[PDB]
Design a protein around this nucleic acid. Structure first.
Ligand SMILES: [Ca+2]
Ligand SMILES: [Ca+2]
Length: 289
DNA sequence: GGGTTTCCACTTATTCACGGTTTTAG
DNA sequence: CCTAAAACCGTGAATAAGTGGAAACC
């Protein structure tokens, strides 16, 4: 094992995909103020893509990888001084989804802990206000212990895709390359490239159609950006990710996706031998892989 | 060393990735 | 008539986040 460096925009794009921040406020009787804290950033992936965590850790030289279950692997960046490396990276390469607001409050808690103010109750009360507008909110225990209020209202992030490398990192995490075999008589193979995201990023999802110049948005939360015209796929969708290399097992799925795209380009998908060969490539990829 | 950090094990709520069909476009 | 691109489904699980516990640090 040697690991490889990852494009920082592909990394920042992947952080927008599967990344997550954490801010812990735990009841600690041994603590002086009665509550200890832990701040950092984490990513949880499947064991099949554990190489990404090693390559992400090799690029930053921070964080630790530990098994997050029988079928999961996680990377946690909890060291305080090491968080400065993750912070300085995101300042130069900012987030574009609804996670940028979480990083803004991630810095707002690092600064409280930077001045060592997280040991006094007056400073701890500030950390309780930060946790409200971030994350999933405070638990019932933390809400009962602190009746004080916080006012900020996390505003919806309005940003645009900076470059293709961000899209490559985001699509590597939240993108799906599917080969659709529609059933019909006589003797249909369809290629679709869907991307699922929450309704909170509908501003980004709507801009994704104009950014690539194609696609339609389907419609509970949820959302979906789908492209089906083979002219757009073979000319605007497939060559974009070929220039900006992907990361993870989805690259091998993309590699097997281009093979079926070349057959449709040669129009050999109508042949029985071509359709049979597509079934072999389709079954040995995506969920079957 | 006495609070304080940082690390490992392990869990939980839901947005995912992903599949398959029925129906319209042209 | 024909193959294409669009529209509708539907769910399991890999996620996005979370806690308990104790070691390790200074
Ligand atoms: Ca996400
Ligand atoms: Ca994924």
């Amino acid at each position: 094992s040697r690991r490889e460096s990852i494009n920082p925009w592909i990394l920042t794009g992947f952080a927008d995909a599967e990344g997550s921040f954490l801010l812990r406020i735990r009841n600690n009787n041994k603590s002086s103020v009665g509550y200890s804290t832990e701040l950092g950033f984490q990513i949880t992936l499947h064991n099949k893509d554990k190489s990404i965590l090693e390559n992400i850790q090799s690029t930053w030289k921070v964080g630790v990888i530990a098994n997050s279950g029988d079928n999961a692997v996680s990377l946690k960046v909890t060291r305080f001084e090491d968080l400065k490396v993750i912070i300085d990276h995101f300042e130069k390469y900012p987030l574009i989804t609804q996670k940028l607001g979480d990083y803004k409050l991630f810095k707002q808690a690092f600064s409280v802990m930077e001045n060592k103010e997280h040991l006094k109750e007056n400073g701890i009360k500030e950390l309780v206000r930060i946790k409200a507008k971030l994350n999933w909110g405070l638990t019932d225990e933390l809400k009962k212990a602190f009746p004080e209020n916080i006012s900020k209202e996390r505003s919806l992030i309005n940003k645009n895709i900076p470059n293709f490398k961000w899209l490559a990192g985001f699509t590597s995490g939240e993108g799906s390359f599917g080969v659709n075999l529609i059933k019909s008589k006589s003797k249909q193979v369809q290629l679709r490239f869907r991307i699922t995201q929450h309704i909170k990023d509908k501003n980004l999802m709507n801009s994704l159609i104009t950014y690539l110049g194609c696609g339609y948005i389907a419609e509970f939360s949820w959302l979906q950006f789908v492209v089906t015209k083979f002219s757009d796929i073979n000319d605007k969708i497939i060559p974009v990710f070929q220039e900006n290399t992907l990361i993870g097992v989805k690259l091998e799925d993309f590699e097997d996706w281009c093979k079926v795209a070349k057959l449709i380009e040669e129009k050999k998908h109508l042949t029985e031998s071509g359709l049979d060969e597509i079934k072999k490539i389709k079954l040995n990829m995506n969920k079957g892989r």
